[PDB]
Symmetry: C2
């Protein structure tokens, strides 16, 4: 069931999630298409179907054989004030997912699975008010705040539902750390 409509639906999903220019030789590696002739045909298609759709989104080739899924000039100028302005880096966001899944987690455990790198991520996330640091037996316990819940779509702020939703995120996007979770769990089970 590795059909053509699924090859094409995968192409447009990559152009949606990338937001940046990408070439056929670049998509060929990540998407896994062999014949660049076939991959290119899918993008002229996906571009025309948005063209005849008269939709605000458009797919055009830019610079050296690279394709994008931008917004048209005519509408981007209208929705300028809706662009997000993120404040967190890739490392801080990665440590936030670890805290949101292990919570309540001892601060020393995070820095074990992150290095002294996270010493400034935890300070930044407490500064942003997205995590708490409750003092516990000469160390700290980290978890997500109410502000984290509103920002991320949990009106409930159920700590068990958040530990679930970020178990997928850690598995999906941070697979190296996810086994670094597992490898340490096997260590603690053997150690004591």
């Amino acid at each position: 069931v590795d059909g053509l409509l699924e090859d094409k639906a995968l192409v447009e999903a990559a152009l949606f999630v990338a937001g940046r220019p990408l070439s056929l030789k670049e998509l060929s590696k990540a998407l896994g298409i062999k014949s660049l002739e076939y991959l290119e045909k899918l993008i002229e298609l996906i571009a025309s179907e948005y063209e005849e759709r008269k939709s605000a989104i458009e797919v055009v080739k830019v610079l050296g054989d690279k394709w994008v899924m931008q917004l048209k000039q005519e509408y981007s100028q209208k929705v300028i004030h809706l662009m997000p302005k993120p404040e967190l880096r890739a490392g801080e966001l990665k440590t936030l997912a670890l805290i949101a899944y292990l919570q309540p987690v001892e601060q020393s455990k995070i820095i074990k699975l992150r290095g002294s790198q996270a010493y400034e991520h935890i300070k930044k996330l407490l500064e942003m008010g997205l995590i708490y640091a409750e003092p516990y037996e000469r160390t700290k316990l980290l978890g997500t705040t109410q502000k984290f819940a509103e920002l991320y779509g949990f009106p409930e702020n159920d700590p068990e539902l958040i530990k679930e939703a970020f178990k997928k995120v850690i598995h999906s996007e941070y697979a190296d750390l996810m086994e670094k979770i597992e490898k340490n769990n096997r260590k603690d089970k053997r150690e004591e």
Copy 2:
């Protein structure tokens, strides 16, 4: 010429550029639609046209009367490795646009139009290798590097084309600073 197909094309452009949940009462303010009955009808429409399209992108309502333009689960798991992982904050990116448009610009001038805030933005951007700091007459001259050009789609690295493309960005997204540019230009003209 404020038609219906332009009301609808503006709705989908907001859902594209937001990436986050937004309610009808929220879109009503930014988009400028009055009747929430009419605005809501546009979104059930724009959702069905993607539904019958059998496209990887989907528009669903989540939580409390809020609408999103996500990727379907089935494809997001495939294109995980194409998500961007930005390293810059909103302030650093804002100072980068100012440097990319005023280049070559004296460092003291940036901090005038940014405060001591930019003292760490300039240090971070030099650290990232996106700007240079050439010493000039007891101060520094800031401008964008080659690495900035490849990242942002200028294979040419023509400093005049970059000063142009970021004159739009500063006008569009940083209108407060754009007149703070103008107000200081009027000051320098009067001062000397």
